[PDB]
Design an enzyme around this catalytic site. Sequence first.
Site, short mmCIF file in Angstrom:
data_model
loop_
_atom_site.label_atom_id
_atom_site.label_comp_id
_atom_site.label_asym_id
_atom_site.label_seq_id
_atom_site.Cartn_x
_atom_site.Cartn_y
_atom_site.Cartn_z
N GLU A 60 -41.39 -102.31 -1.40
CA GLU A 60 -40.40 -101.65 -1.16
C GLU A 60 -40.59 -100.18 -1.84
O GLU A 60 -39.52 -99.64 -1.79
CB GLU A 60 -38.97 -102.34 -1.80
N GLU A 279 -35.39 -88.86 -43.98
CA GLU A 279 -34.28 -88.24 -44.62
C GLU A 279 -34.42 -87.31 -44.94
O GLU A 279 -33.03 -87.21 -44.21
CB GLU A 279 -34.26 -89.19 -46.26
CG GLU A 279 -34.46 -91.00 -46.30
CD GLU A 279 -34.51 -91.18 -47.35
OE1 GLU A 279 -34.60 -90.39 -48.44
OE2 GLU A 279 -34.20 -92.88 -47.33
N1 LIG Z 1 -36.43 -78.16 -59.69
C1 LIG Z 1 -36.44 -79.37 -60.10
N2 LIG Z 1 -36.19 -78.96 -61.54
C2 LIG Z 1 -35.91 -80.27 -61.92
N3 LIG Z 1 -35.19 -81.19 -61.12
C3 LIG Z 1 -34.87 -81.49 -60.23
C4 LIG Z 1 -35.81 -80.07 -59.29
N4 LIG Z 1 -35.81 -80.46 -58.39
C5 LIG Z 1 -35.13 -82.44 -58.17
N5 LIG Z 1 -35.09 -81.86 -59.59
C6 LIG Z 1 -33.91 -83.31 -59.66
O1 LIG Z 1 -35.05 -85.04 -58.98
C7 LIG Z 1 -34.10 -85.42 -58.34
C8 LIG Z 1 -35.05 -85.12 -56.94
O2 LIG Z 1 -35.48 -86.72 -56.59
P1 LIG Z 1 -35.79 -86.40 -55.15
O3 LIG Z 1 -35.48 -85.43 -54.74
O4 LIG Z 1 -37.07 -87.54 -55.54
O5 LIG Z 1 -34.17 -87.98 -54.87
P2 LIG Z 1 -34.86 -89.56 -54.40
O6 LIG Z 1 -34.53 -90.37 -55.96
O7 LIG Z 1 -36.05 -89.39 -54.01
O8 LIG Z 1 -33.46 -89.50 -53.76
P3 LIG Z 1 -32.93 -89.31 -52.10
O9 LIG Z 1 -34.00 -89.87 -51.35
O10 LIG Z 1 -31.88 -90.64 -52.18
O11 LIG Z 1 -32.54 -87.84 -52.12
C9 LIG Z 1 -32.79 -84.81 -58.54
O12 LIG Z 1 -31.76 -85.30 -58.05
C10 LIG Z 1 -32.62 -83.73 -59.76
O13 LIG Z 1 -32.12 -84.61 -60.95
MG LIG Z 2 -35.48 -89.06 -51.84
#
Ligand SMILES: Nc1ncnc2c1ncn2[C@@H]1O[C@H](COP(=O)(O)OP(=O)(O)OP(=O)(O)O)[C@@H](O)[C@H]1O
Ligand SMILES: [Mg+2]
Lengths: 456, 455, 456
Positions: A60, A279
């Site tokens: 076909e 994510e």
């Molecule tokens: N510039 C910064 N100064 C201080 N603390 C920070 C800064 N940037 C991020 N953080 C902190 O570290 C965390 C970032 O960790 P990350 O972004 O890796 O999260 P995760 O554990 O991967 O969470 P998810 O993937 O579920 O969002 C923030 O929630 C905050 O507490």
């Molecule tokens: Mg994360």
Amino acid sequence: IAKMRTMIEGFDDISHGGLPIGRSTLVSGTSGTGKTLFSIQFLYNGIIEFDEPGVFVTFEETPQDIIKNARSFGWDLAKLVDEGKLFILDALSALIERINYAIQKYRARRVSIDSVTSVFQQYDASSVVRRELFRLVARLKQIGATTVMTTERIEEYGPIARYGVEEFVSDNVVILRNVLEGERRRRTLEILKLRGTSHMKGEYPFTITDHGINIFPRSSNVRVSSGVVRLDEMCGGGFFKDSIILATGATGTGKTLLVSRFVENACANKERAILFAYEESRAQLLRNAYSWGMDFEEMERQNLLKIVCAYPESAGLEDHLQIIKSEINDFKPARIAIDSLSALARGVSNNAFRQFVIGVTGYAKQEEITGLFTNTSDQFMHSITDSHICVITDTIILLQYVEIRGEMSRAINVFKMRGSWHDKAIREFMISDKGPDIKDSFRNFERIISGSPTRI
Amino acid sequence: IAKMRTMIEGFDDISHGGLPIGRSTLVSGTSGTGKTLFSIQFLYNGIIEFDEPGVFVTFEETPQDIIKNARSFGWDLAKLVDEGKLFILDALSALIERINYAIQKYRARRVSIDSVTSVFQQYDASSVVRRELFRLVARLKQIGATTVMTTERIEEYGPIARYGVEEFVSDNVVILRNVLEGERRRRTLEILKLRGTSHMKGEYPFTITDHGINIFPLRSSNVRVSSGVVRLDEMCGGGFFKDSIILATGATGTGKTLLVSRFVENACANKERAILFAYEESRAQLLRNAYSWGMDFEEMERQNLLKIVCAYPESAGLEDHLQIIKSEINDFKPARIAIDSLSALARGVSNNAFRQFVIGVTGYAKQEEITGLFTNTSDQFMITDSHICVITDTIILLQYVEIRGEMSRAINVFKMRGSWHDKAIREFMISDKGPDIKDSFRNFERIISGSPTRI
Amino acid sequence: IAKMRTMIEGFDDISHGGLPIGRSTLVSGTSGTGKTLFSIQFLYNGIIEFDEPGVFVTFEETPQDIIKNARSFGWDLAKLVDEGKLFILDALSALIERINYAIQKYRARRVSIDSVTSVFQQYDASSVVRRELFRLVARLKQIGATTVMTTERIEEYGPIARYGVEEFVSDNVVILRNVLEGERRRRTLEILKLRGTSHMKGEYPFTITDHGINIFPRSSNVRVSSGVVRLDEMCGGGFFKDSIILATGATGTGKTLLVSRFVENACANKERAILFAYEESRAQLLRNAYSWGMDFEEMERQNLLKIVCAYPESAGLEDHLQIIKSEINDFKPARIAIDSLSALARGVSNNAFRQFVIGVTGYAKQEEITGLFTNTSDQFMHSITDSHICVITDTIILLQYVEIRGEMSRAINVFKMRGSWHDKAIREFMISDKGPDIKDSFRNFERIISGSPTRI
Ligand SMILES: Nc1ncnc2c1ncn2[C@@H]1O[C@H](COP(=O)(O)OP(=O)(O)OP(=O)(O)O)[C@@H](O)[C@H]1O
Ligand SMILES: [Mg+2]
Ligand SMILES: Nc1ncnc2c1ncn2[C@@H]1O[C@H](COP(=O)(O)OP(=O)(O)OP(=O)(O)O)[C@@H](O)[C@H]1O
Ligand SMILES: Nc1ncnc2c1ncn2[C@@H]1O[C@H](COP(=O)(O)OP(=O)(O)OP(=O)(O)O)[C@@H](O)[C@H]1O
Ligand SMILES: Nc1ncnc2c1ncn2[C@@H]1O[C@H](COP(=O)(O)OP(=O)(O)OP(=O)(O)O)[C@@H](O)[C@H]1O
Ligand SMILES: Nc1ncnc2c1ncn2[C@@H]1O[C@H](COP(=O)(O)OP(=O)(O)OP(=O)(O)O)[C@@H](O)[C@H]1O
Ligand SMILES: Nc1ncnc2c1ncn2[C@@H]1O[C@H](COP(=O)(O)OP(=O)(O)OP(=O)(O)O)[C@@H](O)[C@H]1O
Ligand SMILES: [Mg+2]
Ligand SMILES: [Mg+2]
Ligand SMILES: [Mg+2]
Ligand SMILES: [Mg+2]
Ligand SMILES: [Mg+2]
């Protein structure tokens, strides 16, 4: 019973070499299951490695339509017919004569019929199909030519064939499926039987890519750094080179922080690394990374870091694997990172997710690649693991939230370290504008692994 | 009703002696279930076990193909003509005549027909099938020759036969299955009925090997053996029991593989053969971690004393894993084995299918006086056990203990069947030479919670 | 509407006496459901008690084949036909004539037709079966002969008959089933209806044994010893004679220890006892028992103890009961023990398991037999009970693990004692080379029923 290789990555190990030699193989399945893709792929490969003459008995479909569609993977079937290496027989007991004749003028090797069900609608009555099917099979087995016959199907979990009498006649039965679970399609191949031979029972996740079908059925003491010094001190010389590290913890604990520092360290020692994010997106990652003092944009400028951002529901779990594989086969990073598995397990079968983790782990360890896979836990304050595949990981760096004097502080501890010494202390840590700062552990606190501590 | 041994491992216990004497048995099932295999095996074993004449009636394919298919198990056609012990009839009331011919010709005893469902293409009515079915069996019964009939099936849980009128005429009904659950197929055989005789009700897990079908039906000395660790032997009050099943449960990274590595080492140390079944890590990995504790697994295999059978749990089905263990122990013949682990084989598996596995390994291991140490990684670290710690004679559970913000680990002999053991949860550590069982925690409470309390 | 007894243990109480007299009874069901076993059993019993002349109208089966199969239970049908007490009529409107004739030469009593569905394949067309079925039934009701008609079936939970029009014609409808749940077959009988009479609705677990079909639809102050003195002291004179004792507890608590001491005590007072083990085997039991100073081998030498070791998945729950019954009807022990119910409830229906416990309990109490049933709990440290049938047991001797100063100690307490005083103290105990040693209870500890105690 000798088998004949098809050069189809996966099918060669599933049927233990290939398909019974001098016999006919029936490949049934629904529409878009890859009944034609496999059919021509069985000839192409055969007439590209062992230089074997293969004839295609189309029905076909037009002899140019087949070649016009094979160009999706860069296959010049015209050049195959321009050297008498492939013959397409455009289309009751006289059809076997032409096939027996053509194959004689094209020394019997590989033959494919697509499809037999098509030229049987005018017969029907179940018993008729069998009678005329047996004669065909027998007529091919007498010429001793490895023939693949295509059969149509209505259900993915019902009758093997349209008249359910083709599998009883055919010696070998391969069933191609395209099951839809949760508005998501999954291609799975299976070998129902194979007379006078052995094969792998059950169905194996496959996909169709630009190479065609893709069926998916050391241990040195070399240590590598994770980007953090105290972390390598807690691991007693950093993570192992050819090993799988896991970063389990609650939301906003510092998983992506450790991944960033793990990928940076690669580029720091002029080592390639891939970051598979599901994510967040490149945009956010670069900002978050730069906020900790990491130049992710620059790391890609040196051709040492690659970022493959995509949603966990965008493609299928059987697909995502191929992407990681092809992404590693090209760039060839020394270490990779997955952020995260939690996103790749949401609205997926517990078994279907187990086959994924085993795949990445195997391939990651097979190519001696260091993979830092992160996993977000449900209860932020903690049971164990949903599908509990923490037995696949050689190291487990879990992070836990610790509430101290009405202050939501965070803590890190090396839970596991296969064939290596590690620190068994739940050291507290904080985040700054330069990454993690692992300090001293909580000695004057009790029940720290149960969210809330206790004064001592 | 006299029995007839078919020499099919499992079937001679399921049918209570075998099949009815001078009666017609019907073996229905789907395609690839192993209908032809059984049919050949029935005659083959019958020919080379009691010098009995066998007549195979082909229908679908030719005598050469059938003879060329048994070569996958090592069965030849030396009885076909070179001994005149295997008569094959290539292919309504004219067929029965030819059947009675070879029968009385070679004083026939065993007969196999494959398949009868293919001789009812024209007849689309059940009435015709039954009429021409009864006449066959009735004739065959008049000659009183143990005959096996093969029929085809559409569904694994539907009509018994294609026209659903064959099991009613047939005296004995056997049903071969190939049920697919979770992208994994499982071959199961069941004896539906057996007129004027008894048998086993329900379906029993079987597999097809290079010796053919392997159907799976359904002592105690005070001799002690060392576990590899001295304190552990002291905790069991003389070491592990010889012909006993030991279990090591705990959280991920508690040290189950450590206790396994020492349990297997101690074997080879006393020039004893041991087999290690890994389903979590690979040879390469195990060899590295082992050496890191001061154990040379490679050396152990260099003396033909230790064997390593690494295989992903998801690779094969539960029924195949069992056969792989049995055959592996039938070759090497170890004095003790170790499974790492059961939890890896209980992932995406039915609780009933898993129960049949653990019963088999335990039974077979306890039936050959083989000491087995099975591990089981506990899901929720730092509760219970949703399985079977009743089957195991000894239970060495490992638990993580958080003390002064330090992830410490503890061990205790939870139970020791018909033996004295230490009822103390003593803290232990791992070094570059194995475990170091120290003292327990007398000034700590709720040590079972995973988080103790200052007494 | 008078009924006629069939001497079939179970069916006599399910149909309240038997089946409507002078009427026809249709028995439908799938293959191997015992359609023939019941058919001849209805004649055999009938022509062995009330000396009644019964004719068997066979079809697709030979008159010797029926007698050759009835010899599975030691039934000489030849001797039945050697005194004109049973006539087998080997086999359209002339069949009723022979049946009407034979029954006249064999004074109408019990008649069985096996089967009517067989001689109807040449008719089919649903409406035809009914028309020719009605005439048959009517032709039998006019001669007033209790006739049982066999009918074929395709599904265990579908059409009542092949053409689904036999139940509407037949006055009485009995359905025999062979349902397969979890790769395990279960035979269940049911009375769909019975015109102008009463019967037991629903399906009742039955089996076929060497006696044929087996359908399964006091309270003195006499006290007995359990083997342990302190235990009898805690029970205020030991367990009651005609009562059910339960030994609930975690793995390795001392259940089999109490069972061994409970069975020993029987043999000690020259009393018979049966031990039904499903977790261990004779070999292990003898060793474990001898380690506590009990000679189980010797106890069997005096014909006072019997050991019936077998796996809980080996046979069916509806079967296991018959084994216990026949085992008690032969040996006739004064007391029995089950080790254990937990093993007899694994991969079984909560209701199907409830019917078992009720069966053993009833029969155990019906024959005034003392039964010590043990039950292993899931959480070792404890909710209550999975199927919670602790309301069937008159006494509950639960054992619980108690962690004291990093020492896994064990404790015993008499939780319940129907119409008897008991000790309400959680006494600690240990195991030695002579059985249990119940010491003092934990007075300086709190929360002892929650695994972990508390200093006071
Ligand atoms: N510039 C910064 N100064 C201080 N603390 C920070 C800064 N940037 C991020 N953080 C902190 O570290 C965390 C970032 O960790 P990350 O972004 O890796 O999260 P995760 O554990 O991967 O969470 P998810 O993937 O579920 O969002 C923030 O929630 C905050 O507490
Ligand atoms: Mg994360
Ligand atoms: N270049 C390509 N890249 C990715 N996927 C492709 C490509 N070409 C085809 N496909 C996928 O594979 C399918 C082609 O399969 P094929 O034409 O063999 O189907 P079939 O099962 O033979 O169908 P039919 O039943 O109509 O004969 C497409 O529908 C598409 O899903
Ligand atoms: N050497 C072998 N090793 C493993 N499996 C084998 C081997 N030989 C045969 N088999 C298995 O057994 C099957 C053969 O069973 P068999 O040929 O009897 O099928 P069947 O049920 O009779 O089929 P049909 O419906 O066509 O009659 C193969 O499909 C394969 O699954
Ligand atoms: N001596 C015996 N001991 C135990 N079970 C037996 C014995 N004899 C027969 N059986 C069981 O009972 C069955 C016999 O039942 P019976 O012959 O009445 O079946 P049926 O329902 O009439 O079958 P059909 O539909 O073919 O007429 C056997 O298949 C077997 O399962
Ligand atoms: N060379 C070593 N030195 C010190 N400690 C080690 C060494 N090798 C392993 N360990 C310790 O032992 C643990 C691993 O033990 P093992 O692999 O036997 O545990 P397991 O419970 O079987 O783990 P899994 O759940 O991964 O199978 C590590 O997490 C670490 O604490
Ligand atoms: N000779 C002995 N000396 C001391 N203690 C013993 C001896 N034999 C057995 N024990 C102890 O008593 C326990 C035996 O109890 P038993 O074997 O009755 O267990 P159970 O509670 O029935 O458990 P399960 O049936 O789940 O295995 C052992 O775990 C051990 O603690
Ligand atoms: Mg196509
Ligand atoms: Mg076959
Ligand atoms: Mg391990
Ligand atoms: Mg019958
Ligand atoms: Mg016990």
